[PDB]
Design a protein around this ligand. Structure first.
Ligand SMILES: Nc1nc2c(ncn2[C@@H]2O[C@H](COP(=O)(O)O)[C@@H](O)[C@H]2O)c(=O)[nH]1
Ligand SMILES: Nc1nc2c(ncn2[C@@H]2O[C@H](COP(=O)(O)O)[C@@H](O)[C@H]2O)c(=O)[nH]1
Ligand SMILES: Nc1nc2c(ncn2[C@@H]2O[C@H](COP(=O)(O)O)[C@@H](O)[C@H]2O)c(=O)[nH]1
Ligand SMILES: Nc1nc2c(ncn2[C@@H]2O[C@H](COP(=O)(O)O)[C@@H](O)[C@H]2O)c(=O)[nH]1
Ligand SMILES: O=P(O)(O)OC[C@H]1O[C@H](OP(=O)(O)O)[C@H](O)[C@@H]1O
Ligand SMILES: [K+]
Ligand SMILES: [K+]
Lengths: 322, 322, 322, 322, 322, 322
């Protein structure tokens, strides 16, 4: 045991979505391991190692679907583990954890700035862009395009149940970007006036499928019907290593009361069930490009990003297992 | 000029959606004419006739998209106009208005029952049915399938911005039918487990397109993707005669405060526009059948229903114009 | 109650597929009703009427999927019933039965000849044609185009489990048409070289779907994939009136021993089940035209054949019912 | 014999395409029969009848693909024939021919004006319309839309080999309509900025296929890919009766030297063949509506226009055969 | 010149399909080369080298379509050839042959086990799986998912003309997996109820096409129609190196008497030809993933398996050539 | 600053299309640098270097869309820049420019031959091949197929506005190959009889899209519709490196007088604009393979060619910028 309160508070804030967005959650988890190592009262390497193992498990068991979270945890603990097994002493192990965490956080920020600069080259002056949910990676693209002087407009879908569209609409409007807010249902009706679709990712699989906020796959479907480019802005740590060896991504089922508030739901007949999937799966055929910090790829090149950057680890257990 | 308060009240309630659903609005318009004729203090036929024309205009000018409304007005008013011009006296004209209105209302009730009987024969034991918005015609189908003892389950989409799915869920649950409630964005995600889609219509056009609650076209699109039958339950007075001669159906744009309540919306910046189309257009390639009170048709036979039942009137002006 | 042995022979032969093919089965039922009438030793009209109702039920209950059978029984019995109810005497009723039967039989032959003539105009010199099962209407198209001097070749699919393709291969070779015989599985491999697909039908529904020998829909699907014309050759009595009011066509499931001979099947373990659907459903989007004895139609005009030839009868009970 | 020179000159001008456009050719053929009857020196009904038979055959054997030509001929000669067989005398037969011709010509003009008014309701302010070849029916639609004050632009495809696009571009520009001229190859590249496609027809078949100028089917294909409405403006006399009974429309193969001028072609190697099909076939699935003078139809309703207006004649020989 | 009888037995058994299945055939060829080496009575290395070149040619020339066979021969002979050319003595060369053969055989077994493990993670409790032919790699996926406690059912297609489905049905039943056996023609009818499709492969090409038992491509086509996952279970030695430099894979045509027994076939007329393709080509757009022993890939990454595992060898002649 | 006349002449000829075809233009640009270095009167390395940079800019600024040009310039100029900066003397820098240019030219010639050899293996005896514009790479494929004795016929599309098909027709005829010449609009009409499509490329992008002569995308579209293979013959220097980082490829808009000659065009009204894009974009879903000098790839592996061969240079500015 001996876990710092910031670890428990971060885990709780991921679970409740007080902190959300797959990148933000990954950085928050890195930031928690960092604070555990900063404040630990461990005397021994053995002790701190075991704390970080435990902190890591607590953070992993918060929300399952966005692989950014375990990838952040892995980034920090592959390096902490290797230091430990190599015989590092207390302060060397501590610094390894703190510095790996800071590396992940810095690289996450840079990757998003770079995704914006790359994706903005695909955005043309006059473009109407449709988006979904709230993705910092997607917003980075739209924001850089606007800063380049391209006169754009963003159609923002409200993204039920949690209303993520409101966040997006207000953020974009605050940079000076003109916004059209519509309900999710209206996505097809307005796909004809749309030039480009720019969305985020929580996990991208080996076969090129993108797992993102519920409703994503519908927008991609009708963008494809209408020949509107579907561009997924996503960091390489959105790529899902275990899909290489056949693993299915768990789709997170969140609380019914996030759809129908508890005051109302309790009055409803028992033979109504409310189902609240937080994500869906978009097949690669409905995706034109994935914009990563290292460049544009077709969706079927996702296996390459995973082979080159993640494959080596799959013959090992997780770096926080005993 | 001497218009009774019920005509005004009916109209206000149509505009505000306190009275809603295509068939219901049609019935209420006929009723309101019925009441104008029952309570008229007119002493001459010309004077009654003039009241019925003005009331028809008030009722016509409430909500555009659902052709059931003008079709109801025409049902009554063609018969009223023929009687006025053939020399009917006051009491004869009055009765023609009342009785035509009654016929329209009664025929509407029977047509929804018959649609149920016919559609229910396409529902099989164990079917998972997805629906959208709240359609009395679609519900008649599902209710009758259940009464025949077929064990069905209905996936009900929330139907933002007005939350029509709530109505549908509770109504279907009340008859004994299990319901799964989902946000609109989840319709693709659950199309794999769906056997049948059953929705209603506000207007059906000469080439077989169905105009229905915003989001309908998305559900039909992914249904077709998945080889799930799309059935549209629709009375013959949902068919739109002006489309035979090239008319485009106006899609109603409703208040943005139905999407974002006024308190919230006034705090938003000027450069976010909220757009709130109440309907969309589903093309005929994504519809398998239309279930009318006269039987099952491919959507491409919408023209036949229009020719044989409404075409005759297209050489004439509206039966309420001077 | 006094049913001649020929009715029972006919029913048994229909059941075992010793008599088969939708047109033939229909003709045999009309034949059976004719012989019941000829050989009846009834003395009063009611006693003959009872025999004919009962013989019709026996015939109707043999094989459910091809509607040609009940359309034949109806052709006769509508006429017999109307005669009986107008107070027809015994010999008048007898002869109505016999003459209505003869007339269905003659018209069926003529219809098949005329489908031949109309269908052959769509076959072009040099054409390679793929067929499925053994359909006398389809063979009529092919035999006629060859008689006009067009150098055609026909690809005959084996049509498991009953090997219908063997019947078709031998018949077509017998007229001097060169045949390529292939297993069903090869239909896609050879679709590239196929110019036209020509198949029959057992029932055609109000929305334009064609129910025909199991496998038909696979062939139509890859035909449409390859932009190869799919032409269905079908008499007007293959159109299914009950589908206008929502009825589903029942797919006959036949004995598993037609797939795996009993001698072999009883050695197999109990946890292997053999499913033997005799028909499948091809949707109308994969059918280019239906060739009837009255002309070429798009599949979507099946509802017109039905409205015009059969819809009158739907408001009544079956003419063999009490 | 005894055919007036205007018959030979008209036939020659159809063959050389000095007169072209399916409507114009049909009116020209009517106008020729008219002038034969006006100027004939026949003494006897028998004589004039036989002249008109012969005039008719000369006109029919000019160009095969646009059924407007035989339909015009039929319009005149069904009535001339019936008069003759009914015993009409010389001047009565003469007037029957002259008046039938004038009827056809007047109705053709009205049908085109009416097609424009109907189709223009489908054109929206701001629309970019793409067209192909030169169709008076299509131009009628675009012209009426512009006269209504809709700010439109027409993308005109050049329509090789004969450059019909130039005619269209100059005609539209002369009404004040802004035009973009592009090569045929550029149709896909500009389909994204296109709102609507409006083209003509030479023949429309029973199954809903449209035969129009070579390249039509490509534009329809990519309009369908991009969800751009394909609207075919066409008079009911563009509908092809013999397709009801299985007839394939001949695709006219015009002279190689219309593609490669003779001065150049003679210098080319003998193993180059130039193929010059004047038309192609557009499947109904790629057509949204057909706009006739009697209203909007889906393409699959073409069989109805043919059943109701032309079927009765198919059991007779042509009205100019012996 | 001195080839042991086991090489000839193996070749004959491959030819007659007494030994069959792409992996098995490959293992048997490696086995045959091993035994030639063990039993050789050669005294010099050149004499053994000559025997092994010749035995390889004998084996290569049995059945052309499955590349597993030449990839096995290559695995051994590349190694044997390199040993020979480095001046290996007789026993060194013998043992290189024997040990290279053993090693291909062991790795093949391991690969199939591991495909099982990786593929099983994509099968979910409750799944209905459709397969085709008899593939040990596909069966490995299915047997493992069942061993993990997932309640699956498998739909086995008959796989004419050789009835491979019987082998598969009995094998799967033997492990306690419930089986539904159907004719090939029924694959579309039952695709609605199928959750996953899992098949093997004989060769996989550089652009991602899968050549497998005749019928495979029909199944994949209607699977994609219905949004059912198509998963191909295939060892890395099913990838076809020669296709990287443009080679087409030859489709074996086998004896017509495998379709129609000789006893029956010689009674048939000469103008019926029986075509018996053993394989067909499924394009990569209809394949969701390939499961190899090194992981899951999109079909489009077949070129990477090839570049990385085999492309080195392409600049040389076959290792059994002179 | 002292630029030789050949650099200027080369540039004029590129702009005017007296020199055209992607590979040819690349070769001519390398040649022009070669000549500048051969004839330079520079006395210092800096001075030569400056000449080569200015010449590179002049050559770069001729025509945008075909990346072969800048790729050729880079080939030479990277090597020149590395030599300048590593201290090379005048004669060493001169030779580096000459010899790099020679290598590029020689490698281009070999690559087109190799592409022929590889592509020709996908062409089968009796194939009808459709091509578009004039591509040396595509022609190498067809020429080699013929030399192998495969009896092929080539459908050559006219390729307006510049009539490139004329060149193609005459060239292919000269080698012995029969040709059918058609207008671009006829490509769909003849896609039924086509076995293979073989075209070239000007640029291939990171996601697998091919930019090629205007109209290419239409032919690929209807080819896919028809299950006709679309093969793109393209050297690795057709691959576009800037697209890895989001760059959009500029489509060249050429003089309208290439479409309508100047004499005609000046007589046209102001409100006709002639638009003349020289290229379009074909998406990767409509391409089956790309045939490079290193082998056959799916279009989705374009990224691999870009990564391994061009990616290294993207951190640096152009090797001709100051
Ligand atoms: N549901 C799901 N599909 C996945 C996953 N990883 C890859 N896929 C692939 O994503 C595709 C989904 O296609 P769909 O079924 O949505 O139309 C399939 O090809 C499937 O094999 C995963 O974790 N979950
Ligand atoms: N299974 C079935 N489908 C029918 C019947 N009548 C009409 N259909 C129609 O056939 C089509 C089947 O399309 P599929 O689901 O096979 O892709 C649907 O449009 C459905 O409405 C019937 O009796 N059975
Ligand atoms: N070529 C041709 N097709 C016709 C004609 N009449 C109807 N069709 C129909 O038009 C469609 C053409 O489809 P496609 O082969 O172009 O993709 C087919 O369904 C065919 O049966 C005709 O005269 N010629
Ligand atoms: N028939 C055949 N197709 C191959 C082969 N290698 C790759 N392919 C590819 O397989 C695909 C076949 O698609 P289909 O024509 O069956 O619709 C094409 O994209 C083609 O380029 C081969 O050896 N044979
Ligand atoms: O009426 P005709 O055109 O001969 O055949 C129509 C259809 O009826 C047959 O069914 P079965 O063999 O009786 O099960 C075949 O499926 C055939 O296509
Ligand atoms: K074909
Ligand atoms: K399914």
């Amino acid at each position: 045991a001996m876990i710092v309160k910031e670890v428990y508070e971060t885990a709780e804030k991921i679970k409740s979505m007080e902190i959300r967005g797959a990148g933000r959650i990954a950085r928050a988890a890195a930031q928690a391991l960092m604070i555990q190592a900063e404040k630990s009262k461990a005397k021994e390497p053995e002790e701190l190692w075991n704390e970080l193992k435990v902190a890591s498990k607590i953070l992993y068991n918060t929300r399952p679907t966005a692989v950014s979270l375990p990838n952040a945890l892995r980034y920090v603990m592959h390096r902490v583990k290797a230091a430990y097994l190599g015989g590092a002493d207390l302060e060397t192990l501590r610094f390894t954890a703190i510095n790996s965490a800071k590396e992940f956080i810095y690289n996450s920020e840079k990757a998003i700035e770079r995704i914006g600069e790359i994706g903005a080259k695909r955005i043309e002056d006059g473009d109407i862009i449709m988006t979904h949910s709230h993705s910092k990676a997607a917003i980075s693209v739209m924001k850089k395009a606007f800063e380049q002087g391209k006169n754009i407009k963003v159609i923002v879908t409200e993204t039920r149940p949690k209303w993520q569209g409101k966040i997006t609409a207000k953020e974009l409007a605050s940079y000076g970007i003109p916004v059209i807010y519509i309900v999710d249902s209206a996505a097809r009706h307005y796909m004809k006036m749309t030039d480009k679709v720019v969305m985020g990712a929580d996990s991208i699989t080996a076969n090129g499928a993108v797992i993102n906020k519920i409703g994503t796959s519908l927008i991609a479907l009708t963008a494809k019907e209408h020949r509107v480019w579907v561009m997924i802005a996503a960091e390489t740590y959105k790529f899902h290593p275990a899909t290489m060896l056949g693993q299915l991504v768990e789709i997170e089922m969140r609380d019914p009361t996030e759809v129908i508030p508890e005051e109302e739901l309790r009055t409803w007949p028992k033979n109504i069930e409310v189902w609240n999937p937080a994500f869906d799966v978009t097949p690669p055929e409905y995706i034109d490009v994935i914009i990563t910090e290292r460049g544009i790829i077709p969706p079927y090149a996702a296996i390459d990003i995973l082979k080159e950057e993640f494959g080596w680890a799959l013959k090992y257990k997780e770096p926080w297992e005993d």
